[PDB]
Structures are given as C-alpha cells and as structure tokens.
Design a protein around this ligand. Structure first.
Ligand SMILES: O=c1ccn([C@@H]2O[C@H](COP(=O)(O)OP(=O)(O)OP(=O)(O)O)[C@@H](O)[C@H]2O)c(=O)[nH]1
Ligand SMILES: [Zn+2]
Length: 516
C-alpha cells in the first residue's frame, strides 16, 4: 500500500528520534492496574455505546481521563510552539502554513458535526443521500448529533488512545495476566514492522492469543474513546512493545528537536508526494504525524496521555515570518448543514444594505445562529452608523474574517423563508448577492414593541457579542443601548412570541472562522 510506504519512509527518516519505551509503557500499565477503578472504565464504555450523550456523560469521561492522567508517567504537557525561520527555511514554513490550514479544515469537518449536528428532517432525496454519505465518513427536531453539550471545547483531546491504558484494560477487563497481554501485542507489533495488520492478520493471531478476540476489527478510529479496543489501539500498543524497530509511536519531541523533526517530515513529503487530503474521516500517515506533533512541543505525541492538553494542533503550533480559501469554504458548507431550511429564520443587519458590517440569522426553534462581521468600504457613513446605531469601532473589525457575506448568503438553502423587521434592506442585500429565490416576511413591529425585550436579551446573551463598544445616542441627546444584528433577531422574535425563553443558542459558524 501507498499508506504503509509513507509510514516506512517516515520510520527510516525519523529513526534517530525513536526511543526504547516498553519499560515505561508497562510501568504505566502497572500503575493503572493498581490505581484505576475499572468499573468506572466499564461505566465510560457503557456511556460511549449510547447513540446520544450529554454533559453528564462528558463529565464522567473527563473525570476518568484525569484519574488516568494522574496515575501515569508518560504525559504530554501544554507546550505552545512558534515556528520561525532557521532550521526550517522560508519555503518550509510556507508549506507547513498551507498544510496546517488544510488539516484544520479536515479535522473540523470530521469532528465538529458530532456536536454541532446535521439536519436530517424534511429534505430532498439528493440532500439526504449526500448528508448520509458525510455522516458515514465521520463515524456518526431532525438534527443528528452525538454530543449535546454546553461547551464543545471540553471534547478537545478526550478521546485519544494510549498504549498503557490499552494494556491495562486488556489485562483487567479481559481477565488475563499482564504477561499474556504483552505477548499478544508484541506479536501484533512484529507484523506491524512489515505491514498494517488486517482482519486476516488479527484472526490468525487470535488463534494463538485469545485476548486479541476483544478487538473488534470491523469497527473504526472515529467517534470512540481511549477505553475502546480498536485495532488502531492495539497496533499502537504493540508498536511500543518492540524496543527498537524505528516505530513512529515511540518518538519524543522537545522544543530542542521540534523544528528538526518537522524538517525530516517535510523531506519525506517532497519525496513521496504526501498531502493533507480534503476528505473528512480517517487520517493518512502524514495528516496523523502532523496533527500529533503540532498538538504539543513537549511529549510523546503518539502514546502519551494528551487528555490534559487544551487547544487544537493549529492553535498550539503557529508559523511566523515576514475571501475564504477552498478549505474554509468546504468547512462553511458543512457548518450550514445544521440549519433547518423549513424552520422560522430571522435575519438582521447593521450597516446599510450596500455595505453591511454585521450580519445575523437566527432560528428560534432549535436555537442556532449565524453571526459575522464585514469591513465597511464607505468609512464616512460607518462613523454616523457607529454614533447612531451600532457603536462598533472600525479597528475591531480588522481581526474579522472577510469573504463571509458572499459565501454565507450563497450557501443559504433554496426557497428558505426569512422573517425580518423592515424587509426593504435585506431584499436589497440578498438581491446584490444573487439570491432572489429567498422569500421574505416583513414583520413591522413599532419601535417600542420591537425593543420590549431588549434588556431581557442582553441580560441572557451578552457574552455572544463583544463588538459594540461605542456610546450610542439618539436625539430627543440621550444614551441608548447599541444595536447588534444578533440581539435584534432574538429580541424581535421574543417580541412576536410575547416572551424570551431560557436555553443555550448554538453558533452555526465556528468562531475559528468569524475571526482570523
Ligand atoms: O467530540 C469528539 C471529537 C472527536 N472524537 C474522535 O476522536 C478522534 C481523535 O483520535 P486521535 O486524534 O486522538 O488519534 P489517536 O490518538 O486515538 O491515535 P489513532 O488511534 O488515530 O491512531 C477523532 O477522529 C474523532 O472521531 C470523538 O470521539 N469525540
Ligand atoms: Zn453584535
């Protein structure tokens, strides 16, 4: 296979950074066997069998992770890394910039729908099939979601496999002696020196080593945990049982060696034409090593406990030197799948329709919202708007992502029906953007009725917009509350429905995309 060729070439080029870690991995497995509550491993295992999990299920997982991370010596530390010209060339850093940007889009498109969700209700045959095809790639009110959680950033890094845990769970849960588990994984590792073990390989191994019957081979790397017995998990643990063999799983990184490692990876990339793919789902060898090494400047990126790490690899490793990309568009198109095209949808803008600076759409029934900004072109008019309506400081918009207006409007589902307050302006912007299919309801609240819930809305949802800093005034002058497209949708809807309800809203766009 192509994939094993990349793996073997990466194994030769990085041989020097590999280490002999069997002793430590077995010591950690021994510390878990003495210290961990395996009924709580079984409890997490039950919770992962559930098609739909909540924050109560996440706490049980996070808490088990922390208890494992306390018992073990192989731990990765929070180590952010800035890459600069030197060991890496100017060209090296540009290639790495592009690859991490592509990987960013790949991982978001794979993981984010597990929590953001994909609408699967009243839709065409064509749409449902495409959506099912995406759901099958990534291991997954008519919205399909696996995690129903308040803070999705708490899923980050809680799902990784660890050889010491796999070894300790195979022993205790499998009911065999540690020696018998190491034997089995050692044998699996041996195969792994020459090929990636297939179901035919496990089947044959399991005849001499019964413990490996716990591995379900028709399973997958996705949507599972460090407590599940994937072939991926065993193959990694088996690769640690070697001491020698140039196994990638054994590599150590420090800030002393991170640049050199990446440089060697880049050598293999150029030689074999490795790439980040644009398909969500399972990672090729390169996508894998890059993701892992970038997660932390200090650790064993393949085999350490990583459950304490906050941040994404593209956040923890950055490149430095002195519209949306295709990768960003793909991300966005996928994010939009959360929308119910049949649901009540509000829209509101700040700025004139020819030059909007804040756009928002809201669907009250599910609670999802689109919110983003735009640099104004006509600065003169923006200053009057700041003073009289939105109090946004033009300098604050500098850190926003451009290109969103065209791309979001372009991807609004067909024949969708949008409610607003003063349809006149939205029509103009929708028309300027190429969407005359979108039908509008104009609601015509009076000024005083439209703002009945203004204070109610800011009280609940203030943390959802920080853009409005300026003192805003109206002539009789009196100080007023600034106008935000988002709060305006929310408050107008509450005004129509005579009441504002208490529950989380769900941001349709990743924040990693509203801002650069
Ligand atoms: O909320 C989430 C997000 C992601 N995941 C799942 O976690 C996976 C992260 O898998 P890892 O990136 O942690 O790779 P790994 O350490 O386990 O090493 P390998 O086994 O891949 O060789 C992702 O592929 C995703 O499907 C969840 O289970 N829940
Ligand atoms: Zn706002």
């Amino acid at each position: 296979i192509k994939s094993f060729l990349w793996t073997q070439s990466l194994r030769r080029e990085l041989s020097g950074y590999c280490s002999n870690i069997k002793l430590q991995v077995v010591k950690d497995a021994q510390a878990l066997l003495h210290g961990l509550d395996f009924s709580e491993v079984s409890n997490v295992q039950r919770l992962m069998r559930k098609e739909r999990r909540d924050d109560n299920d996440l706490k049980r997982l996070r808490d088990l992770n922390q208890a494992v991370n306390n018992l073990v010596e192989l731990k990765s530390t929070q180590q952010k890394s800035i890459l600069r010209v030197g060991t890496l060339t100017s060209d090296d850093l540009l290639i790495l910039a592009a690859d991490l940007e592509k990987l960013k889009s790949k991982v978001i498109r794979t993981e984010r729908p597990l929590s953001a969700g994909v609408y699967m209700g009243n839709l065409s045959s064509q749409q449902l099939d495409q959506r099912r095809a995406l759901l099958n790639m990534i291991g997954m009110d008519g919205v399909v979601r696996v995690w129903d959680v308040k803070n999705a950033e708490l899923l980050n890094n809680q799902f990784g496999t660890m050889p010491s845990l796999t070894l300790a769970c195979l022993t205790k849960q499998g009911q065999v002696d540690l020696n018998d588990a190491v034997q089995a994984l050692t044998d699996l590792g041996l195969i792994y020196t020459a090929k990636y073990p297939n179901t035919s390989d496990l089947d044959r191994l399991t005849q001499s080593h019964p413990i490996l019957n716990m591995i379900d081979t028709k399973k997958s790397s996705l949507n599972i945990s460090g407590y599940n017995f994937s072939l991926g998990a065993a193959v990694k643990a088996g690769a640690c049982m070697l001491d020698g063999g140039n196994m990638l799983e054994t590599i150590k990184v420090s800030p002393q060696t991170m640049d050199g490692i990446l440089k060697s990876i880049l050598k293999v990339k150029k030689a074999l034409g490795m790439f980040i793919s644009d398909t969500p789902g399972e990672r090729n060898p390169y996508e894998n090593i890059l993701y892992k090494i970038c997660l932390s400047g200090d650790g064993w990126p393949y085999i350490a406990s990583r459950t304490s790490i906050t941040g994404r690899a593209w956040e923890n490793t950055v490149v430095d030197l002195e519209g949306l990309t295709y990768s960003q568009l793909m991300t966005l198109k996928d994010a939009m799948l959360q929308l119910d095209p049949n649901a009540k949808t509000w829209m509101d803008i700040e700025g004139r329709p020819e030059d909007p600076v804040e756009i928002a759409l809201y669907q009250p029934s599910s609670g999802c919202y689109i919110h983003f900004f735009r640099e104004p072109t006509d600065l003169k008019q923006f200053k009057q708007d700041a003073k009289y309506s939105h109090g946004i400081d033009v300098t604050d918009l500098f850190a926003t992502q451009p290109g969103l207006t065209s791309a979001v409007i372009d991807a609004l589902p067909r024949n969708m029906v949008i409610t607003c307050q003063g349809s006149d302006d939205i029509r103009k912007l929708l028309e300027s953007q190429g969407r005359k299919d979108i039908k509008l309801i104009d609601i015509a609240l009076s000024k005083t009725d439209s703002r009945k819930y203004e204070n109610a809305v800011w009280d609940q949802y203030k943390d959802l917009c920080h853009m409005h800093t300026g003192v805003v005034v109206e002539k009789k002058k009196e100080e007023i509350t600034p106008h935000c497209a988002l709060m305006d949708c929310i408050m107008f809807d509450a005004a129509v429905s005579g009441g504002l309800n208490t529950s989380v809203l769900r941001a349709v766009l990743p924040r990693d995309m509203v801002f650069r």
